[PDB]
Design a protein around this ligand. Structure first.
Ligand SMILES: Nc1nc2c(c(=O)[nH]1)N[C@H]1C(S)=C(S)[C@@H](COP(=O)(O)OP(=O)(O)OC[C@H]3O[C@@H](n4cnc5c(=O)[nH]c(N)nc54)[C@H](O)[C@@H]3O)O[C@H]1N2
Ligand SMILES: Nc1nc2c(c(=O)[nH]1)N[C@H]1C(S)=C(S)[C@@H](COP(=O)(O)OP(=O)(O)OC[C@H]3O[C@@H](n4cnc5c(=O)[nH]c(N)nc54)[C@H](O)[C@@H]3O)O[C@H]1N2
Ligand code: SF4
Ligand SMILES: [Mo]
Length: 720
């Protein structure tokens, strides 16, 4: 029975459900959904079972040090820990230059933590070595959005779900990975039964059980599938010339200006009969998916890691946007190209705040000299303080750590020893005997702590205040509901003290609380097309999220970007009803991206596709959801999914232990036989620390976004 209800945000998925925390003064006792946030008071099982996680005593509550490598982690005071951290970082810079140090962060960090980490490093130390886990996740979608539209982030919101009359859901297990949203998608098809749902995924998941059509294409061939859809759309005159002639540009396979006829000529390469064999699907599915897509009153695509975790990730994102653009299924209620964000805070913390190695806050870029000056001005730095070279992107960061080039690294609210691709390579990198690794980590079973030289105990979740920005441009405050336990401190406060102690100019880190940093971030955003000056803490305390752009206390926020009358970045006096202002002529761009494959495709010797996936009960590495007994009752440990008519024809039964092996490692797993994986595909989950699947996975990255291709590599299976 609670006395106080404290408003915040679910700690887990990018659906970003508002949460109310019931405290019986000082202890959280109950949790409900925020009736006033988009989720309308609905929480999924994970969300609803957060109170045990918050209450867990299995927490990191004092700072810890590992005197020597391979030693034992032992207690140390906060002051010795802060001096040790600051002296090491200063010493490294002094001897070897800013690029010898790095920040490795998280879309789970509060927007304020990431904003301070990013400033200390980019403006304080003078290094652009600030990256994070959204690199493993959302970087393809950023590239797809910037190359297609000139600006990052969806142009619609979740509310478009209520109006789509077709959902094309590709690379997304919405029901297991975005359960609230999937229910809203289910809800919509309930209310209007003439709503069509296409689910495109090599796996037949719970998500397909509301689909009119499930396209179970061969991993990696979805680019061809989607070009092929565009061919049908053009061929059957289902396209929208009034839209694309005014609003669209066309870039050929080399990225040179082209035209509709160019596009038609290129698409001839993607005829349905030919592309149907590549994809291993009945040709009727291409015609079906295309016609549904184009004939529908309002079409919405939603996609996640099956599209992004790919060496052609940016290109795939482009291809989804091509369909919306050729058909004009965009900038109207129900009709948009909506990339789904995994993490609660990839959008606000890392992407919008520019906390990646090539980026600067609010739409600005490292290589852009005017943007550096804009930031040196706002942040009060000398000229040239901000380096012109992008720092290390994640994969290359950990390679630099391994070579000795990065000597000191902070890891904050991520578990990279468990979740980075090609683990054997990374664990060797993380074991460099002369490296100094500092972990800010709340739960001591995180495997990465086994490589840490120093561990700082942070406040978790609603033990402190701060903003999370979910996938629909929604910035939502979590207020503080409880004191942190033991010696846990807000990471914002820890970062300021680290900076001060490490000789950073104190005017650069002039913040007492997360609120202070928010007002600066508001200021740094003002005038950009990411503007949220209008999101004062006061408004964020009272409201259940605001959606940007929101440039004044009287502005309600923005649902439809790029749309005159809706989006304030679009002049009221603009000639055309739409304005894609991230492109100099106001036109979104269809990209004629050639369709290729995975970087490690199957062959005689490794004849299987290996994928990796999300499972509903388990959040990533299970340091949180693992503290909840009910979350263990269904899938307690790792398994490997195997296709029925692949199992029998190769002589493998259900339940039998098997060896999944790839060029990089081998691993015994309990087989799980179903019709989930289409023939020629197996799939492993990644929440079991006793089964570090990322040891089998390769490391190739999209050459633009530098996202790893976790979704595809080549494997073999044999009976144990
Ligand atoms: N329960 C739970 N929910 C979560 C998370 C969690 O750990 N647990 N994490 C959150 C985060 S950070 C993220 S990023 C999201 C991720 O959520 P999703 O991306 O929706 O979930 P995944 O299983 O990673 O998604 C992969 C889907 O893409 C498919 N796929 C495989 N190969 C291909 C291909 O070649 N083409 C296409 N088009 N699809 C393919 C897989 O079969 C799989 O079903 O979920 C979020 N929500
Ligand atoms: N094979 C394979 N690997 C993948 C993926 C895949 O699809 N396949 N998906 C990738 C994607 S999309 C993502 S998003 C990444 C995510 O990968 P990670 O970010 O490595 O996984 P998480 O379990 O979210 O790690 C968050 C950590 O933060 C700690 N923590 C919780 N609260 C606090 C706090 O207040 N402060 C601090 N300091 N720490 C805290 C938790 O204990 C946990 O260890 O995984 C990637 N890895
Ligand atoms: S759908 Fe995501 S944000 Fe909503 S309660 Fe479930 S885990 Fe939390
Ligand atoms: Mo993610």
């Amino acid at each position: 029975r609670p006395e106080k209800w404290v408003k915040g945000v679910c700690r887990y998925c990018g659906t970003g459900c508002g949460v109310l925390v019931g405290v019986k003064d000082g202890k959280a006792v109950a949790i409900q959904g925020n009736p006033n946030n988009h989720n309308a008071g609905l929480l999924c099982l994970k969300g609803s079972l957060l109170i045990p996680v918050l209450n867990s005593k299995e927490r990191v509550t004092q700072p810890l040090v590992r005197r020597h490598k391979g030693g034992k982690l032992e207690p140390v005071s906060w002051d010795e820990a802060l001096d040790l951290m600051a002296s090491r970082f200063r010493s490294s810079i002094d001897m070897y230059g800013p690029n010898s140090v790095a920040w490795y962060g998280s879309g789970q960090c509060l927007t304020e933590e990431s904003y301070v980490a990013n400033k200390i490093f980019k403006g304080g130390f003078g290094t652009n070595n600030v990256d994070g886990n959204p690199r493993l996740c959302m970087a393809s979608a950023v590239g797809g959005y910037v190359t297609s539209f000139g600006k990052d982030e969806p142009m619609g919101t979740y509310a478009d779900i209520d109006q789509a009359t077709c959902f094309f859901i590709i690379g997304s297990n919405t029901s297991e990975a975005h359960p609230v949203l999937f229910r809203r998608i289910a809800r919509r098809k309930q209310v209007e039964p003439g709503v069509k749902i296409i689910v495109a995924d090599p796996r037949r998941t719970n998500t397909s059980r509301i689909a009119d059509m499930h396209v179970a294409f061969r991993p990696g061939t979805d680019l061809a599938f989607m070009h092929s859809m565009a061919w049908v759309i053009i061929n059957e005159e289902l396209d929208n010339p009034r839209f694309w002639q005014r609003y669209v540009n066309f870039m050929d396979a080399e990225g040179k200006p082209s035209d509709f006829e160019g596009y038609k000529a290129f698409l001839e390469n993607y005829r349905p009969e030919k592309v149907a064999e590549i994809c291993r699907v009945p040709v009727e599915q291409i015609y079906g998916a295309a016609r549904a897509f184009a004939e529908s009153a309002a079409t919405m695509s939603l996609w996640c890691m099956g599209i992004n975790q790919r060496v052609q990730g940016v290109f795939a994102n482009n291809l989804i946007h091509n369909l919306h653009l050729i058909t004009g299924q965009i900038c109207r209620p129900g009709a948009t190209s909506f990339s789904l964000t995994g993490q609660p805070n990839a959008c606000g913390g890392v992407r919008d705040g520019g906390a990646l190695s090539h980026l600067l806050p609010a739409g600005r870029a490292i290589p852009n000299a005017k943007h550096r000056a804009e930031m040196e001005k706002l942040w009060g730095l000398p000229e040239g303080r901000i380096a012109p070279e992008p720092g290390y992107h994640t994969v290359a960061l950990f390679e630099a750590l391994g070579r000795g080039d990065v000597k000191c690294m902070i890891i904050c609210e991520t578990n990279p020893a468990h979740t980075l691709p090609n683990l054997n390579k990374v664990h060797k990198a993380m074991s460099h005997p002369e490296s100094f690794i500092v972990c800010i980590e709340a739960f001591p079973d995180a495997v990465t702590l086994e490589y840490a030289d120093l561990v700082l105990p942070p406040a978790f979740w609603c033990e402190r205040d701060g903003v999370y920005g979910c996938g629909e441009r929604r910035y939502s405050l979590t207020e503080k509901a409880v004191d942190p336990p033991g010696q846990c401190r807000p990471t914002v406060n820890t970062l300021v003290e680290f900076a001060r102690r490490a000789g950073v100019d104190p005017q650069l880190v002039n913040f007492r609380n997360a609120e202070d940093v928010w007002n600066e971030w508001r200021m740094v955003s003002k005038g950009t097309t990411y503007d949220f000056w209008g999101m004062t803490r006061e408004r964020l305390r009272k409201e259940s999220g605001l959606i940007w752009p929101c440039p004044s206390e009287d502005h309600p926020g923005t649902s439809l970007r790029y749309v005159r009358g809706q989006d304030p970045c679009v002049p009221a006096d603009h000639p055309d009803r739409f304005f894609f202002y991230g492109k100099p002529d106001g036109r979104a761009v269809i990209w004629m991206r050639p369709a290729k494959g995975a970087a490690e495709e199957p062959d005689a010797e490794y004849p299987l596709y290996l994928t990796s996936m999300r499972v509903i009960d388990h959040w990533h590495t299970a340091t949180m959801t693992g503290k909840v007994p009910e979350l263990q009752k269904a899938n307690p440990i790792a398994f490997v999914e195997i296709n029925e008519e692949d199992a029998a024809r190769t002589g493998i039964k259900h339940g039998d232990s098997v060896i999944v092996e790839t060029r990089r490692d081998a691993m015994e797993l309990p087989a799980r036989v179903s019709d989930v994986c289409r023939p020629g595909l197996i799939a492993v989950p990644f929440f079991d620390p006793k089964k570090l699947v990322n040891k089998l996975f390769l490391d190739a990255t999209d050459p633009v976004s530098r996202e790893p291709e976790y979704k595809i590599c080549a494997a073999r299976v044999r009976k144990a």
